[PDB]
Amino acid sequence: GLKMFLAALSLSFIAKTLGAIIMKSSIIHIERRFEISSSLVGFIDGSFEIGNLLVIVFVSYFGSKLHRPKLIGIGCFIMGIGGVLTALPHFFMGYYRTLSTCLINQILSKGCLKESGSYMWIYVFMGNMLRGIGETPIVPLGLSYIDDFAKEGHSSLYLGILNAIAMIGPIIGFTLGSLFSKMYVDIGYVDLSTIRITPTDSRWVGAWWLNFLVSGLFSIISSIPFFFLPQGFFQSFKSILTNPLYVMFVLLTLLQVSSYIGAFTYVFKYVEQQYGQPSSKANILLGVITIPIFASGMFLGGYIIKKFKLNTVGIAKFSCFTAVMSLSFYLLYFFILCENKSVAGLTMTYDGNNPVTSHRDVPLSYCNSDCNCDESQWEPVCGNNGITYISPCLAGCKSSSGNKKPIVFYNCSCLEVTGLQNRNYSAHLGECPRDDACTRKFYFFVAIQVLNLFFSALGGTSHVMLIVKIVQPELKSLALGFHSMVIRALGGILAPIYFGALIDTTCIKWSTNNCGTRGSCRTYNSTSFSRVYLGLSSMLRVSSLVLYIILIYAMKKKYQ
């Protein structure tokens, strides 16, 4: 009889997952467009959790479940509104808007402060918090209703089946995300034949608002069927944290999730700054190749735990095994890397021959000297030598071909290598793409990501199964609830934040905002991005592994 409820919940789970990706696939765009640092784009990303942590508290004191289906419905409806709200800042903000050649010819010749636009991110941040306030009722209350209507061995298995179908969402999310990150932000408003920036450039902000509008409409449509369907605490918390093992595990999980959440939030920016790949490719490769294998990994983990008869002391050893395997593959990321992009004036002297300690305050070279011009304009042009430059004026170029589609500057004062004197010094817009070898290494990156995430998923269910055998039977609901709350809150709100702070400390060139304020990051120090990204994710992981080993030792003792 209750097939209706299951269908509806599946729609909702598909909707929930679609929502989460639409947020993490638009990070590279929202950040790029509202012009905020990586830290805030982490804050905005976390606000979703921030809302989740809010709704929890409000129900805990002065709230409770009542008529589950209508509640799930109002939750999904609020999630959809929130998606629509998050898309809304685009319709009342304005158009998302340097080719100046050398001006040796001419030499020695308030509103921005009051920029509400500067706190316009506060809109998206709110919308995401709405989404968080609305999503929370889905999972726990849906599982409660299931367990209310379930025969022997049904509610839990139902979680499994629903989780499987949910994996159809990330597939569409990334697929749609790959489609809308190729469409310029003002698509339909501006004639797309004049926009010079390309999807590979670092100023390209794709249609994120389409992502959010589609996610919101899907969420509302999935909220529709839920209507017309049905017709002390602290004391235990004390105990749950009194059990040393539980504490070890929650800490163990928190460490890994923070390594997962940071990596997910900034994987698109890492793909783009290390290898030359845009966001559209990354999105679709994660959606077509990685997600089916991730679902296969989750299924295989469940089956391995269900068939091989792995007990408590054994399930922990198996999950640790998955981790050693995942970490091994992750630690391989450090051998499939790529040299730094030589951005004259940022990683080297302007003459392109001497490398310097600081990106900041690099003295102008003869070539980039008399040509006085801005020093905060990121209009990158790469020359025949293959070294990126900052701006056509900072490269000392004199003449331009014109607004014709291929814009090739000439007579550039820099690029004064003596080996190409007979050759020209033309430099076309954009940065120059990385050598083929790096594009090749991108595929090793995708393969290592696939294998890592497969071995990660292999231990997915094991986490829930363990969090229930490490704790006394009468504390389970509270123990798993506190686990989920700690993981979501801490990992979700803090990890996108400090990962972005450290990625910020790796940034080389920032862009002026409306009124003289660090805006967004135009180019990064790839190698440092790695040591701060791949590095913080590895230590968090290694530390998780280290505690597991300790946990296994202890479990091997407690039961023996």
Ligand SMILES: *[C@@H]1O[C@H](CO)[C@@H](O[C@@H]2O[C@H](CO)[C@@H](O)[C@H](O)[C@H]2NC(C)=O)[C@H](O)[C@H]1NC(C)=O
């Ligand atoms: C780029 O430099 C070339 C070579 O100097 C310029 O071509 C010469 O321009 C000047 C003035 O017209 C004269 O030397 C000759 O008429 C041109 N022939 C050459 C090769 O000497 C060219 O005009 C410059 N283009 C700009 C404005 O960037």
Ligand SMILES: C[C@]12CC[C@H]3c4ccc(OS(=O)(=O)O)cc4CC[C@@H]3[C@@H]1CCC2=O
């Ligand atoms: C598998 C996933 C899509 C992308 C995933 C990912 C991708 C790269 C990544 O970092 S990477 O260095 O391993 O590539 C971390 C993660 C963490 C989990 C994250 C999602 C969970 C649900 C989902 O559909």
Ligand SMILES: *[C@@H]1O[C@H](CO)[C@@H](O)[C@H](O)[C@H]1NC(C)=O
């Ligand atoms: C330099 O540019 C000229 C056009 O001005 C082009 O004909 C030439 O092939 C380029 N390089 C060489 C080999 O001189």
